[PDB]
Amino acid sequence: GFESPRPYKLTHQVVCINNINFQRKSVVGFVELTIFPTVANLNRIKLNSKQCRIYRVRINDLEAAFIYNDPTLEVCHSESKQRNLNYFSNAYAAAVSAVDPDAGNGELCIKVPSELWKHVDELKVLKIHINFSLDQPKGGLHFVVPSVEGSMAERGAHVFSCGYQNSTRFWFPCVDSYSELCTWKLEFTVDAAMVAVSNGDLVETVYTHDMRKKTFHYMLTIPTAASNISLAIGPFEILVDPYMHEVTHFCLPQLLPLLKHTTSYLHEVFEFYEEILTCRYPYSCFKTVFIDEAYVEVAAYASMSIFSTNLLHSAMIIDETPLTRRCLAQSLAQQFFGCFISRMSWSDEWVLKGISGYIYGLWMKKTFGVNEYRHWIKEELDKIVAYELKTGGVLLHPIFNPASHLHFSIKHPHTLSWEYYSMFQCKAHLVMRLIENRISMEFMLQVFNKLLSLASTASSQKFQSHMWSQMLVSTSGFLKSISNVSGKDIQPLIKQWVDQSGVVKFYGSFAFNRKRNVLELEIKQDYTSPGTQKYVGPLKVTVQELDGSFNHTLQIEENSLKHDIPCHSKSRRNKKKKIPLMNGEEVDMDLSAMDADSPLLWIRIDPDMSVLRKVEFEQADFMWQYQLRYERDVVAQQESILALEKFPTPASRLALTDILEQEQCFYRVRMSACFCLAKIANSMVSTWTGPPAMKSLFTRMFCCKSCPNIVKTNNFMSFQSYFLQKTMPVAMALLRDVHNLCPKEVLTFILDLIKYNDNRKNKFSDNYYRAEMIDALANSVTPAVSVNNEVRTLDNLNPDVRLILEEITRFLNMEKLLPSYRHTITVSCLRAIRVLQKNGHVPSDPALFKSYAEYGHFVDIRIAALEAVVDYTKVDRSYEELQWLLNMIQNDPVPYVRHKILNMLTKNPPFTKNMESPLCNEALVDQLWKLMNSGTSHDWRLRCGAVDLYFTLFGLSRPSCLP
């Protein structure tokens, strides 16, 4: 049951936009809402509006009086001397709650005229006509206007609606909540050479009487929220999908072949999401818009998605096809379960984020294989256990503070830190995988189909929300639908992993009792760390003995420590028979390293990742080597690679080398075995016999049979030896001699890989392989032996580093004339120059990176150069570079770059709270408090980034470096 927090119900909204002026960055328009009051004596009506100048408001064609105030413009007063962050977080939460449409509130308060009170008490319709104007928007609509001359379509100028969550208040007045569903009528009067893309279906396109402008009329009969309404106006090249004909793809001019190749996969994503769920795609059209200077890499609205143009690749670009493919896939998953089925509160957001991430993981499983699915699930689980042990924990479904261990309030999406938002979505889809583990996948897809079917029977009624609230899901409704389809309720699993905000830590060690033939496990939990919680459920453990692989369920109550499980025979060591594996197959194992008295080959605690856990198991090194070689699970091979770094014995070198030589191993395991072999080789110097590690293996796999030092000409058509070939010198460059310097046998090998590179014969580009070659050249740089702080000049350069510097100069200059796909070699060469500057080789001068961080460059070059400037101002304690970065945060045209500068200055801070630094003035505290209070008031993501930066630099209490 859904009861509105608003005293009115909104039925229909007309959004008309005229006079989109690109020179002056200005729009004019009106908005006409059709509300039905649910309570009599409505009097004031409270709507949401930011940055719009409200000209006039007429209610039922009668002139009404409005008052506007935004408390989130300046959160705390300018003349308050408070400088602690808990004060700002409480004031910012109160300010966002005072404009919240999820309460009754709002920023624009319109007073109902007196003569309509007899129209409002007996509950009859009210039609509110606001007309507004955005004079030069700092948020919401982003105007990308290039400075080439010509007409606005000839120079490539466009507008798009940017922002996250409820940010539609930034470009027209609305009820900007996900729970106020209404039908829509959208008119946009644009230039005749431009096209206006928006939500709904385009019913017509009429000309103006001078035929210089045309009006696009859109209609949206599926009741969506105001937060799902978008806009993209530009000189877009239109491409109808040749497979599905209601799907149109819009790109920027001159990028039509890239659009043709890139969006050619999307019909398979449509077919997948419509056959695992049994509902068809709910909207009547689908539109993909590719734009410049995007807010996020992929945004999903109702019947529309806005991607950045940096996803567009051609047919000869690999290492970008899977990333763009999965961006399209998660946009479509959010089309199904973020835009059609919406949110009932700010709680129950974990339901939608979990269903979107879970069905996108099912797509990844079918498309890229079960092994890529397991690797992705393991990397997400490692991400969340790292974040939750780092700071507190992520609390899905809080109850309204519920989480007081962290420096922001979790009551609203616009007060969350961006890393918390990312980990929120990550934990939501892992908890949905856990619900699939308890209640099987076919019942899970039946739950999702029941939600979609209730929403689509709801979506066709005309009753104003008598039935339109069946399109809003809640937690209680989701659990009730689960209990309807399965008969089991998941309330212990919901109580543990949703309502409780923690992950578990397992420390395991075993001992084999030879007398009674049992395996005595010893599993203890660390439940006193700040991020942890105590697990009391069951726990699966998989033991591989000589007779095969056996699963055991252990009951781990609070007082439990020793778990005795039984062991089988050892009669497959009496005769040589094959040892049967986890799957149905069996292999020949070399049992010379195994103990004579124990049959068990390896043990895995929680193999299926059925809890949110971090396992620290103490096996013997031969058990880790057997688990690396003969396991049929990629997460166990990865964890054995990760645990073999502590055992540098030559049997582990043989194990990793046999993994590296082995095709029919998953390629991301061999790419990890490269770096593990490099670390082991560095640890057993003065024992290593022959050549450096992986060199003979590289010449055996990727070089000519007649010439060992000449590499084969590039043929990248295998896509697994391409990735292994481009990752093996990067790990090989981490080799070090007894003198702690990279050997001149590996550096010469990398330089010969660079010289003899011929790419005139493959059908694929070479930009990522050459960029990884520059990364391998950067890995070999050891710190220089400066004497008496000698100035680093050209004559006293290292003889090794002069070759590296010549190569990166040649590569960067050749990129200036023949550019790569996304300037990958510019990014790699800037990263390598920063590596050479971090050691004492090149003079520590930020002027090159400051010239590459200007506005007109590509955004990857910009963020690489700004990362180098952030690293410089951390190491050299530069005041003027920090003022340069803070000025670039305040006034840069691209808001993604501002968010990225705040992000990089949070990750690599110039000082922490423990450090005494020269950059701990009252001036810097006043600048960052002014940046939290004012200055970042237009983005909701810059303000949370400024809160994160103030927390990283000064902590939760009063800045110490202050009177």
Binding site: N371, N583, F666
Partner: peptide, 13 residues
């Protein structure tokens, strides 16, 4: 750009 998960060797059915 493709499957690249050697699935027939890890999960044979």
């Amino acid at each position: 750009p493709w499957n690249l998960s050697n699935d027939e060797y890890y999960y044979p059915k």
